[PDB]
């Protein structure tokens, strides 16, 4: 397992191209992870509706990843949801990119919309080596 630190996650996300990706500066992505999962790569939220949110960015199994148990599955990231529980952030970052590339803002992430949008998101990367 793994729980990231803020700056460790910022650096990994930047190595994966997230700083300014589709108009979202790096702190947006760190803030989203903070409030979605508290940086826990294995965070898993199982919803009454039968879908589940997986990993550090709490990506959902209806549209985005396949867990084989969710009605209406589209698997638009073309990954098993297990890949979103990895200690390495590859699948989560690539799927987060795909979400935005499929026409969704960051507003897809409830924690970003509710905790991060409009704030000084740069604070989430302040003092980090990048």
From Swiss-Prot:
Enzyme kind, highest EC tier: hydrolase
Single GO term (MF): identical protein binding
Keyword vocabulary terms for this entry: Allergen, Antimicrobial, Bacteriolytic enzyme, Disulfide bond, Glycosidase, Hydrolase, Secreted, Signal
Principal place of residence: secreted
Localisation per UniProt entry: Secreted
Q: Does the keyword rRNA-binding apply?
A: no
Binding positions (substrate): 102
Gene Ontology CC: one annotated term: endoplasmic reticulum
Q: Where is the active site?
A: 36, 53
Catalytic activities: Hydrolysis of (1->4)-beta-linkages between N-acetylmuramic acid and N-acetyl-D-glucosamine residues in a peptidoglycan and between N-acetyl-D-glucosamine residues in chitodextrins
Q: Which cysteines link up through disulfide bonds?
A: 7-128, 31-116, 65-81, 77-95
Describe its function.
Lysozymes have primarily a bacteriolytic function; those in tissues and body fluids are associated with the monocyte-macrophage system and enhance the activity of immunoagents. Has bacteriolytic activity against M.luteus.
Q: What else is known?
A: Lysozyme C is capable of both hydrolysis and transglycosylation; it also shows a slight esterase activity. It acts rapidly on both peptide-substituted and unsubstituted peptidoglycan, and slowly on chitin oligosaccharides.
Similarity comment? Belongs to the glycosyl hydrolase 22 family.
Q: What is this protein called?
A: Lysozyme C
Source organism per entry reads Gallus gallus
């Amino acid at each position: 397992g793994k729980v990231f630190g803020r700056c460790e996650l910022a650096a990994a996300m930047k190595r994966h191209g997230l700083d300014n990706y589709r108009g979202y500066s790096l702190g947006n992505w760190v803030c989203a992870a903070k409030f979605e999962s508290n940086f826990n790569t294995q965070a898993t939220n199982r919803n009454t509706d039968g879908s589940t949110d997986y990993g550090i960015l709490q990506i959902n199994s209806r549209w985005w990843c396949n867990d084989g148990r969710t009605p209406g599955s589209r698997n638009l990231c073309n990954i098993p949801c297990s890949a979103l529980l990895s200690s390495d952030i590859t699948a989560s970052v690539n799927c987060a990119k795909k979400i935005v590339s499929d026409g969704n803002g960051m507003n897809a992430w409830v924690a970003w919309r509710n905790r991060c949008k409009g704030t000084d998101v740069q604070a989430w990367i302040r003092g980090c080596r990048l």
